[PDB]
Design a protein around this ligand. Sequence first.
Ligand SMILES: *[C@@](O)(c1nc2ccccc2s1)[C@H](C[C@@H]1CCCNC1=O)NC(=O)[C@@H]1Cc2ccc(F)cc2CN1C(=O)[C@@H](NC(=O)C(F)(F)F)C(C)(C)C
Ligand SMILES: *[C@@](O)(c1nc2ccccc2s1)[C@H](C[C@@H]1CCCNC1=O)NC(=O)[C@@H]1Cc2ccc(F)cc2CN1C(=O)[C@@H](NC(=O)C(F)(F)F)C(C)(C)C
Ligand code: NA
Ligand code: NA
Lengths: 306, 306
Amino acid sequence: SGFRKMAFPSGKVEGCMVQVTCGTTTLNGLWLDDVVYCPRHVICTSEDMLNPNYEDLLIRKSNHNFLVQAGNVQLRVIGHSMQNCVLKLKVDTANPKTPKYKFVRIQPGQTFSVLACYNGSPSGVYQCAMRPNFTIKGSFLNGSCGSVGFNIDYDCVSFCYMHHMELPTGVHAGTDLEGNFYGPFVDRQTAQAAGTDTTITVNVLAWLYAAVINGDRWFLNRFTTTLNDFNLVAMKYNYEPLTQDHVDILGPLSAQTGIAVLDMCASLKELLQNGMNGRTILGSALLEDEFTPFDVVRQCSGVTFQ
Amino acid sequence: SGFRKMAFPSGKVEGCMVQVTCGTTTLNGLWLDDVVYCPRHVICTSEDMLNPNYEDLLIRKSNHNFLVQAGNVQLRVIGHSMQNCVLKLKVDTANPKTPKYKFVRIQPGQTFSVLACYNGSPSGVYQCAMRPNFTIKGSFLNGSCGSVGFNIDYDCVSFCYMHHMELPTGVHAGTDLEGNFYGPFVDRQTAQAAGTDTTITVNVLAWLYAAVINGDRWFLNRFTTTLNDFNLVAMKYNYEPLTQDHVDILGPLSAQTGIAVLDMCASLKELLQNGMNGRTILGSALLEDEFTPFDVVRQCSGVTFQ
Ligand SMILES: *[C@@](O)(c1nc2ccccc2s1)[C@H](C[C@@H]1CCCNC1=O)NC(=O)[C@@H]1Cc2ccc(F)cc2CN1C(=O)[C@@H](NC(=O)C(F)(F)F)C(C)(C)C
Ligand SMILES: *[C@@](O)(c1nc2ccccc2s1)[C@H](C[C@@H]1CCCNC1=O)NC(=O)[C@@H]1Cc2ccc(F)cc2CN1C(=O)[C@@H](NC(=O)C(F)(F)F)C(C)(C)C
Ligand code: NA
Ligand code: NA
């Protein structure tokens, strides 16, 4: 029993974290085989921020300008290339701790673990979601750039996020591991801001199922709803539309608990309209939306990772 | 910016997790140097649960009854001893991934990371606190026993918890790594239950300081209070008494923010008496008590671990 915001074990990623320095700029890099991946603006000074031409900045650099440290070991850069907003530094040593891995670009609403790092050394691990507005509500300070987000399946690490920027509301923007930003954000100094966000409906429903699995039913009711009438209410409360695809994905949780998806939707509707009346669900006085249906199944079934 | 329930990076612990099997009972063990630590009731069958005499059960066992697996490698047990409620299995191989480590028995109100494991393989990592009633609000299923809780300082892993039992309210009971239970709990089948719990006042105050650091002040007020008058209110709301020791420990956060501790106490008093009025603090509609003052400083200052 119990239900926690659970991160993936981070050891496979810890062994990949390094420090990259360019002039006075130091940030984190990801060392996989003989390549180190990091944000391209490591090559930026403070002056090259208004509208930096990164191709022009990069052609002016030499391999020996890049100082890459793994622990107390300096790694020599022997090639470099820019891919979108990521710099790929070819180094003279392959990382002996390279896990099985892939690079994935995730959809909004998906969750992942962040290994927050400073100066190439891990500080902490936490779970978050890609918001519908393509920000993440992270915990990142100066020096955190190049920290990565990931999922693990069996023994395979799927990297999905590299950290780049903090927006004026205190939320975070970054790229996939091929250097493409999530959302409309850019790595130049402009008036960018997070767009209006929405609540991840399919995840709220997943978490209500988690609550039932863990022995709590106070919020259930005898009613059902149509998908259309539910979405009319969701829309009013700034919830994402629930698709038939979302309904299918919730099938296993609905089967495990015996509560039809549209029945759980009628519970959520009632919760939106009436509030919790001073009660809590899984220790929360708010409706939690950073657990996917898969997160719930994994934690309530005890899936492990080799 | 941002503030997350952040766990320690778990890689140093992952490399220590093994599987221990005795007859039909399998649970997790912690492999440090040439010793594997696990709950002593691995030697129990279902029948030896009413009032098992563990010394009597253990003298009847042979080394070859214990099957210890690290990954795909079987480790041969060559000695054993019982220490309180932990079994120490001497094995023929020293763990080459043994970190710098120590065993600590923590006080209620302290936090730690749990690496939840099944069949010797890690499933997830999450942060929790030792409650005042010496339970933890974990997330643990059948097979989770022997999973450990820990903190990291610099490069040193301080193990403070090994998992043993789930209580009827769905919360969890376990031992330090020398086999002494936290709280009054025992590893025999009886009517044990969690005692009434209280909220960890010093941690709530720490989290209010975290909120201020992160740019939120809506709950502050112009008032101060005496320690005594605050504790009269805390007592009414089932909060732990705040000691002068707690006040001193909050000194750094008070200095960083310019808000005297007793001033923050008057804010907490007002929050207890009037509620949040539909507002949130650091994304929560409840007063959070599973961040210590040290957790706040570490996360808002970016401390790392070698
Ligand atoms: C990351 O650690 C980096 N720092 C530097 C420093 C010099 C060169 C390159 C980098 S990457 C930080 C993480 C950030 C900082 C502070 C608090 N929390 C965080 O997550 N990233 C930045 O400082 C980025 C980097 C950048 C790249 C190109 C630019 F043209 C401008 C920047 C500045 N920056 C920001 O995050 C800024 N935010 C924005 O510009 C915006 F639009 F996203 F809001 C800043 C105002 C500095 C937070
Ligand atoms: C742990 O994985 C272990 N399982 C076994 C099985 C056989 C022998 C030894 C062990 S240790 C589980 C973890 C637990 C189970 C299910 C859900 N969440 C969890 O955290 N621990 C147990 O099953 C313990 C072990 C035990 C030892 C001595 C006993 F006399 C009795 C038990 C049974 N047990 C419990 O946790 C039970 N709880 C209690 O007895 C009490 F008092 F704490 F509530 C149970 C009712 C089975 C949950
Ligand atoms: Na219903
Ligand atoms: Na005050």
